[PDB]
Design an enzyme around this catalytic site. Structure first.
Site, PDB file in Angstrom:
ATOM      1  N   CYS A  31      52.441  38.138  49.068  1.00  0.00           N
ATOM      2  CA  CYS A  31      52.024  38.875  48.139  1.00  0.00           C
ATOM      3  C   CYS A  31      52.315  39.617  46.840  1.00  0.00           C
ATOM      4  O   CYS A  31      50.769  39.877  46.438  1.00  0.00           O
ATOM      5  CB  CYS A  31      52.817  40.034  49.798  1.00  0.00           C
ATOM      6  N   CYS A  71      49.343  39.218  44.091  1.00  0.00           N
ATOM      7  CA  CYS A  71      48.506  40.180  43.805  1.00  0.00           C
ATOM      8  C   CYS A  71      48.985  41.522  43.825  1.00  0.00           C
ATOM      9  O   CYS A  71      48.063  42.419  43.335  1.00  0.00           O
ATOM     10  CB  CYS A  71      47.471  39.799  45.113  1.00  0.00           C
ATOM     11  N   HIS A  72      49.797  41.870  44.818  1.00  0.00           N
ATOM     12  CA  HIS A  72      49.960  43.517  44.834  1.00  0.00           C
ATOM     13  C   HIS A  72      51.125  43.869  43.768  1.00  0.00           C
ATOM     14  O   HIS A  72      51.330  45.045  44.057  1.00  0.00           O
ATOM     15  CB  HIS A  72      50.226  43.810  46.220  1.00  0.00           C
ATOM     16  N   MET A  77      41.562  39.781  49.997  1.00  0.00           N
ATOM     17  CA  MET A  77      42.524  40.053  51.297  1.00  0.00           C
ATOM     18  C   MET A  77      42.879  38.427  52.142  1.00  0.00           C
ATOM     19  O   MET A  77      41.971  38.907  53.488  1.00  0.00           O
ATOM     20  CB  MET A  77      43.004  41.398  52.035  1.00  0.00           C
ATOM     21  N   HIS A 132      43.106  39.854  31.403  1.00  0.00           N
ATOM     22  CA  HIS A 132      43.896  38.290  32.138  1.00  0.00           C
ATOM     23  C   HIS A 132      43.777  37.507  30.436  1.00  0.00           C
ATOM     24  O   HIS A 132      43.650  37.844  29.456  1.00  0.00           O
ATOM     25  CB  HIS A 132      43.037  37.527  32.601  1.00  0.00           C
ATOM     26  N   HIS A 171      36.476  33.309  34.465  1.00  0.00           N
ATOM     27  CA  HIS A 171      38.146  32.557  34.106  1.00  0.00           C
ATOM     28  C   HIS A 171      37.889  31.001  32.794  1.00  0.00           C
ATOM     29  O   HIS A 171      37.751  30.630  33.164  1.00  0.00           O
ATOM     30  CB  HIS A 171      38.879  32.351  35.198  1.00  0.00           C
TER      31      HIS A 171
END
Ligand code: DHE
Ligand code: DHE
Ligand code: HEC
Ligand code: HEC
Lengths: 539, 538
Positions: A43, A46-47, A84, A323, A365
């Site tokens: 996790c 991402c989190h 998710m 990013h 991206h």
């Protein structure tokens, strides 16, 4: 006692508004630690470490306890169509593990250690002093045409000779090096692992060797060198994911000089974010500065190194989730992507301002992007996407093309979503686009090539992994990279740790297979950086 | 695809991420009883997250290491290094000290944040700039008006300088800390320790509030842009919690920018989770604000030429930066790093640290006292809380480079607990209070030095006695001059249920001149003369 009465009054803070955290479901040490291990493996990316890194509601106890056990087990089990993943329906985690995770995120986030100057210096090492280093190149290698390649799982990198297609030297580094950068003199190759460990490499030694190393945080992704006139090998900057910081070091030795916290207020809601990860960093050619990308707060910082004793930082607000990115053909505008915001931010490095926010596809991206002159629209910069198979072409010429400057002037269509890198070169009339994370195996193992002289025609599909003749394994193809003279484009066949991998080279002029690089040491090859092209930002 | 892209394991090792606990169990009422004591009695020094005081922090790693009994013994008898004794003195019970020892062994409860949504919610424009007078609609002599803080009442009072009468009492935030003037001399800005700011228009028929906003949960400082061409452009305020400062419209108080001061310290260069914003002073050399960040010991030069893309120069000085003020020329900011026993000199023109001068135990200059010494040339002075000295520092690099940034000389006052030293261009006297001195008589009087004869010992003016107030601590604090520079005012800061006053003195003769009393004058602390504050005359 006078000073004790001076500071003896009550805090203006109301005790009643300072809250104790808890009310979470009980779980032993064995249980708690099992969930925690699952958290960082599956996790955290991402989190985030403190659970506020993904889009949507954070996984902090104020929200999780509100939702409750049942809701959480259900969400983790099936996931959501907004990014998710489903952990139960897929078979990834057991119902027992998911119950553990639902309990886990209802507890206060365990705290990872900080990493300041004492930890940094402790980790700092000078393997070879500047006095003991060669005064000139002591080998007969064609350094400009060298390719620095990441042997990801191996925790090493490989220098590959451009013309001979052979591995010249394998070097031990930090785990899973993310990028390679060249010093402005073209003598030092810098690499940084995801574990924040930076290694400095001297290409002039008889056999390229490491001269210095340091660890700048717990987790990291970027590194950069001062590229302003008169500052060759002066400073080296690196950004961390945790702690939320960046560090400026000595260009010759990597001695820690300044460490700056990126924790701060967001650009969108202007609220405090406790974990703004540092993303891409690029050195300015207009001023003696470093352009740093702060993800969550969506800030682009211009850090002036003219006087590092008294750091001057200009904070430019852009868009959430910054990013990657790179320069335009002229090297003045930093075209960076705010992926989750589906936008590309343009940073004017000369005037030091946000030139514009360009609307693009789903999850752009660009890597460092692809610059080329369009017949109808003039000088453009391009990017592919993870959320779709489109390619955005943006006009980058304010002076001689005001009609098209900072506008998504046109689109191209590739094999589909899951794309990571788009590429081209000044001497090339081809534009490559990969599809590494596309769920279709055939598309993930191949690259689309467009004809710049005939942008109306559909792309050609080059079967890269098939050409490799490797056998079993996912064989994902990733990041096209040209050589010094831009007559051949290289690719990485990123196969498993226990499988076989290779680097496939293609003749740019004929689009025919030119060679295939195999070696038992070539484990999990990912990023490839040609010294000349990296050092002179040729893309 | 994006789920596989960001699907790899984080580089952080799970085994190094720690769960906190091993703390003594305590029920809800017990934890709350402790928490209440902690902010009423401890937080001021130790802070919200318990890392604000010198020595070891009161975080679980340390408190649990020391153990239950060590903590109870320390809280009970204190230490000679600044930690008061709560049991010995009889302030707290053994039952309460037990609760406190158990309490600090738990993770620090968290106070709420305070961002732009909270700021805008609290933001109120009371009278729109268009609906405001174009001229002064009253007969008040504004430049000689004093803004006095009625601390415990959550109000301030405007006192006419010549008449000595309260002209208007205004409701403000709790315990206003300082009053500041806009460059135009029209608006009065006050800020409460509760972080609530009030902007007052002195041109209205009756000086009244035109705007208000809350920039945090706890704060102390506020300021206005004083660079040429920037009159009433921006207003800045620094907060204690959250660790931040905010820039607002200098006409409406609309929040524009919020910047976090959480960061790396200047000494150890480690991360500090709670660096409080101390003094803030507006630059005359550039379009910037000079901000002091305490715990990290940083002086930030925040440029407002382009408020959209903020540019900040971070200058390292010394830990525990607090109060400070300009040198006679208004180019060098003389600020005290109290617990470091040093005075940092920030050159606002060249934008660098000019020096770190070693002074006495716990310097506390306020804004300081500037005066030309007969031998050592121009100097800036400060008194202390830790001792009875008064440091004189040379501030003339051009004509007196031998004395520049040197504690050129020293004067001796009544003793420690001093808070403010004062003088004026037209005055030949130097005043120094001693508000927190443990002796009643010393704290109820101030010392005066003859600047025309510095070898001579000081005179003691019995300020509190002159007030004739009866019972109470009657602590006298902060000397303040009128625009003419011939009167010096003092506050007799008595309790809220007691009688207080403002004693005025004839500077020329050192004789009592007036005593301001009023049932409304409750706990009068700081006093700021409009003109003297606006033009930094000290
Ligand atoms: C911030 C950032 C940059 C910009 C650096 C710069 O230029 O300053 C970057 C660039 C890069 C570049 C630069 C290429 C170039 O041409 O400049 C490469 C090769 C690369 C290989 C990968 N990246 Fe990257 N990458 C991340 C972050 C970043 N990657 C992640 O956090 C993410 C999403 C998750 C992760 O697991 O790290 C991620 C996944 C990947 C991959 O899956 C890759 C293919 C393999 C790997 O090692 O994880 N990223
Ligand atoms: C940061 C700061 C400044 C400088 C601001 C500026 O110039 O922009 C300042 C100035 C001041 C000034 C400014 C006077 C001047 O001449 O500039 C005054 C009058 C003042 C009255 C007090 N201060 Fe002050 N003071 C603090 C903080 C500060 N005080 C504290 O945190 C402290 C130590 C503890 C507290 O209880 O808040 C503290 C106690 C006091 C008092 O005990 C006083 C006498 C009454 C009160 O309300 O607490 N402080
Ligand atoms: C990115 C590739 C993810 C990984 C890996 C995991 N999660 Fe996630 N999660 C992600 C997103 C973008 C979102 C938003 C969902 C939406 O539709 O809004 C989420 C959300 C959650 C939630 C629900 C939060 C809430 O709405 O209250 C939970 C509880 C959650 N995610 C849990 C979680 C756990 C336990 C994971 C690993 C085992 C995990 N996520 C991985 C993105 C990603
Ligand atoms: C400033 C006026 C303070 C107040 C009010 C209180 N404390 Fe304090 N404390 C202070 C200092 C400067 C120090 C360091 C003293 C030294 O000699 O090192 C301390 C220390 C403590 C400690 C010991 C910390 C340790 O070394 O492990 C404890 C346990 C402590 N202080 C507790 C504490 C509590 C609970 C207080 C309020 C009821 C409290 N302090 C008030 C300064 C100040």
């Amino acid at each position: 006692k006078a000073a004790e009465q001076y500071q003896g009054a009550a805090s203006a803070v109301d005790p009643a508004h300072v809250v104790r955290t808890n009310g979470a479901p009980d779980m032993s040490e064995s249980e708690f630690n099992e969930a925690k291990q699952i958290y960082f493996q599956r996790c955290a990316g991402c989190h985030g470490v403190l659970r506020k890194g993904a889009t949507g509601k954070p996984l902090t106890p104020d929200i999780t306890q509100q939702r409750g056990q049942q809701y959480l087990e259900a969400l983790i089990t099936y996931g959501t169509p907004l990014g998710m993943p489903n952990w139960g329906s897929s078979g990834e985690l057991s119902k027992e593990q998911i119950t553990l995770m639902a309990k886990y995120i209802q507890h206060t986030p365990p705290q990872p250690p900080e990493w300041g100057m004492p930890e940094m210096r402790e980790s700092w090492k000078v393997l070879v002093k500047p006095e003991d280093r060669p005064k000139k190149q002591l080998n007969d290698l064609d350094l400009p045409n060298l390719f620095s390649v990441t042997l990801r799982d191996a925790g090493q990198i490989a220098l590959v000779d451009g013309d001979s297609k052979k591995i010249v030297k394998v070097i031990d580094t930090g785990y899973a090096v993310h990028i390679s950068r060249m010093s402005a003199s073209g003598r030092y190759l810098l690499v940084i692992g995801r574990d924040a460990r930076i290694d400095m490499i001297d290409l002039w030694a008889k056999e390229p060797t490491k001269v210095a190393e340091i660890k700048i945080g717990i987790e990291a992704r970027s590194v950069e060198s001062s590229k302003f006139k008169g500052y060759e090998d002066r400073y080296t900057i690196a950004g961390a994911y945790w702690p939320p910081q960046f560090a400026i070091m000595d260009g010759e030795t990597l001695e820690p000089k300044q460490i700056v916290s990126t924790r701060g207020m967001t650009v969108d809601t202007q609220t405090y974010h406790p974990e703004p990860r540092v993303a891409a960093i690029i050195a300015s050619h207009e001023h003696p500065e470093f352009i740093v990308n702060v993800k969550e707060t969506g800030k682009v910082l211009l850090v002036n190194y003219k006087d590092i004793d008294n750091l001057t930082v200009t904070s430019i607000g852009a868009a959430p989730f910054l990013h990657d990115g790179g320069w335009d053909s002229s090297h003045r505008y930093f075209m960076t992507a705010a992926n989750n915001s589906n936008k590309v931010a343009v940073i004017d490095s000369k005037d030091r301002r946000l030139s514009a926010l360009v609307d693009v596809g789903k999850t752009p991206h660009p890597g460092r992007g692809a610059n080329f002159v369009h017949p109808k629209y003039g000088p453009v910069w391009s990017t592919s996407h993870l959320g779709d198979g489109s390619i955005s072409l943006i006009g980058t010429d304010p002076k001689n093309h005001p009609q098209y400057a900072w506008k998504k002037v046109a689109e191209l269509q590739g094999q589909g979503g899951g794309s990571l890198f788009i590429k081209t070169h000044p001497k090339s009339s081809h534009l490559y686009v990969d599809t590494t994370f596309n769920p279709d195996a055939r598309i993930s193992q191949s690259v689309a090539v467009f004809d710049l002289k005939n942008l109306d025609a559909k792309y050609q599909v080059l079967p890269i992994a098939e050409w490799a003749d490797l056998g079993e394994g996912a064989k994902r193809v990733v990041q096209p990279e040209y050589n010094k003279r831009g007559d051949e484009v290289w690719f990485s066949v990123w196969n498993g740790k226990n499988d076989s991998s290779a680097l496939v080279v293609v003749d740019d002029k004929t689009l025919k297979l030119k060679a295939v690089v195999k070696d038992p040491r070539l484990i999990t090859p990912t990023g490839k950086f040609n010294v000349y092209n990296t050092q002179h930002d040729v893309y």
